[PDB]
Every structure is written in structure tokens, then in C-alpha cells.
Amino acid sequence: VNYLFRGPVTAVAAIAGEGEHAGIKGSLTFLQKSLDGRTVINGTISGLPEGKHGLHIHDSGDMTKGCYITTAKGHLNPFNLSHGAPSDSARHVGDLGNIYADDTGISVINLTDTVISLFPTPAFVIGRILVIHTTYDDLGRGGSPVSKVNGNAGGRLACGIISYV
Amino acid sequence: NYLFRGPVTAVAAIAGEGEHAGIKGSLTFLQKSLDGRTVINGTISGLPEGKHGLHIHDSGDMTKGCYITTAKGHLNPFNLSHGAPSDSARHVGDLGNIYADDTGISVINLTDTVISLFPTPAFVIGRILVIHTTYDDLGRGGSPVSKVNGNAGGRLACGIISYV
Ligand SMILES: [Cu+2]
Ligand SMILES: [Cu+2]
Ligand SMILES: [K+]
Ligand SMILES: [Zn+2]
Ligand SMILES: [Zn+2]
């Protein structure tokens, strides 16, 4: 069969900020053993402001303008659902929740997801931008008009394209 | 499965680092239909004058920066030898040479029928596009890596091919 659909797939994202956030640097590894399997996500980021930060996969993979996303498209959402928590049934494919940075600015990313895919199914996330937001994802529960659009997590601190190892 | 329908648009943001952080460019890839031709357009600035190999590599991993010497393998799912874009024996990732003149500007307009923006075995999204130090010898160079990668030297700049 087409080798893109075979065996374990490993993907990575090099995460970096720019300008005043050029000190935010890290990486994530995505591992999915089989088409029907969960995806494990592991990594570290350093240089972050302490506290929670939304972690989302965007519909665009376009980084010609750095971490500035020109398109208005929003989070990766091929099933046209509303913004939710990773464990919610009403979520975008790109809704991976919050990560946490300690007071030294280190974040240990350690999570598993059953909605994203590293295989070319409709939930494919390769070739899209992974975003680390300024503040926390309210999981669609904040009562803000944009709570159900993107969790009201603010601007972008750092970005990277999810791609093949 | 929408990854195999309609027209697909992809982009690569090309950048150097270190002594070559002035190298900056972008390319757009357009493929209107599965198995249709792919049209490539863009520009790169800041390059040393002359010809530079342009290849899609097997890895998309940018986590060690662009200038590694660990990932020299071109995208080659069909296990052929390195060649020119028009050669019959070529890698999927073999896009030949671009040219930069004395301004350091390279203008790129290409059409390819080997790469794919759809997830067939010739899929190039999620892989690194590499601009090399010097020219691709198109497999006609006599170095022991002429048929492996065209003997184009190290890397000047990279960019991941991703969805628009
Ligand atoms: Cu977001
Ligand atoms: Cu090359
Ligand atoms: K073809
Ligand atoms: Zn969302
Ligand atoms: Zn080659």
C-alpha cells in the first residue's frame, strides 16, 4: 500500500518565536503507530511566560509571514465543529488544549490525542502550523463571543509547521 | 477525503541562518487535480551569484536547523538514481538548478509532473525544500555522489513545503 499509510509515522514541529519572543524555542514529536491508533505528543519548550498556553493546530500551514497568519481561516476544522477541549466531542481537530510553562519558562509537553491523524485521513495534521498562544485556552467555556471559535487564548507566541521526520 | 479533491495550494517559506540569514524567499505550488501538473512560482533573494541545486529532501525535520549534514537524502520513494527534472531516472525531489544573478535574486517558474500535492507516494508536503551551496550536476558529474545527489554541496537555505 501507499507508504504514507503504513507503519508508525513520526512527525515533528520546530517551535520558535520571533522578534521580542525570539527566546521561545522548542520542539514537539508526534507519534502514531497505526491508522486507528492514538497519537502521542512529547516535547519541551523553553523561554515561555509562566502559566498555561493554548496549543492549537491551525488550518493554514503558511509561514511565509513568520508566525503571522494572514488567512482568517482559524483552527484546523475539517468536520466543522465548534471549539472545544481535547476530551470534548464538539472540538476542532486542531484543539489540543493547554500546555503549562513553569516559573523557569520550561514547558514539558506530554499528551495523547485520538482525533488528530499523522496518516492522510481527513484529520491529517501534517503540513499545518502548530500554535502556542499568549494565554490559556478556555476550552469553549469562557462565555466570550470567541470562546467557541478558538477558546479566547489571545495572540501567538510561537509557531512551527508539523512535518515528517 | 478532501485531501484528494479540488485544487491544492502549497507554499514553502525559504530562509537561511547564520552567515546566510539574509537568504529569504518563498515558493508557491499549485496542482489543480490529482495526477495533474504542478506549477511552481516564487523568488529567493540574497543568494551568491550562480546556479544552485534545488531539491526536496526525504526529511521534513527542521528541529536541528537547516544546516545539518545528517539528512542529505533526496525524496526518493521510487528508488531511482539522482537526475535532472527532465530525466527519466530521477528522484521525486529532483528539481534541478535555480539561478541567482549578481543582484542575488533568483526568479523561479517551473512546472513539474513528478511531485504531488496530494497524498500519493509522490507527496511532497511535509518535506524540506533545500537550496544548495553550488550547482546540481544532474548526475553527470563524475563525483561518487553525482548519482546520489548531484554533488551540490552543503545547504544555503531551507523551507518546509506546507499547505497554504
Ligand atoms: Cu488557537
Ligand atoms: Cu539536495
Ligand atoms: K504524475
Ligand atoms: Zn479550536
Ligand atoms: Zn536527487
Swiss-Prot record, chain A:
PROSITE patterns reported for this sequence: SOD_CU_ZN_2
One protein family per Pfam: Sod_Cu
GO MF, one example: superoxide dismutase activity
InterPro entries tied to this protein: SOD-like_Cu/Zn_dom_sf, SOD_Cu/Zn_/chaperone, SOD_Cu/Zn_BS, SOD_Cu_Zn_dom
Keywords recorded for this protein, A-Z: Antioxidant, Copper, Disulfide bond, Metal-binding, Oxidoreductase, Signal, Zinc
Co-factor binding details: Binds 1 copper ion per subunit.
Cross-referenced Gene3D superfamilies: Superoxide dismutase, copper/zinc binding domain
CDD domains membership: Cu-Zn_Superoxide_Dismutase (cd00305)
Keyword Acetylation listed: no
Positions bound to Cu cation: H56, H75, H133
Cofactor(s) required for function per UniProt: Cu cation; Zn(2+)
Family in the record: Belongs to the Cu-Zn superoxide dismutase family.
Subunit structure: Homodimer.
Designated name of the protein: Superoxide dismutase [Cu-Zn]
Protein's organism: Ramazzottius varieornatus (Water bear)
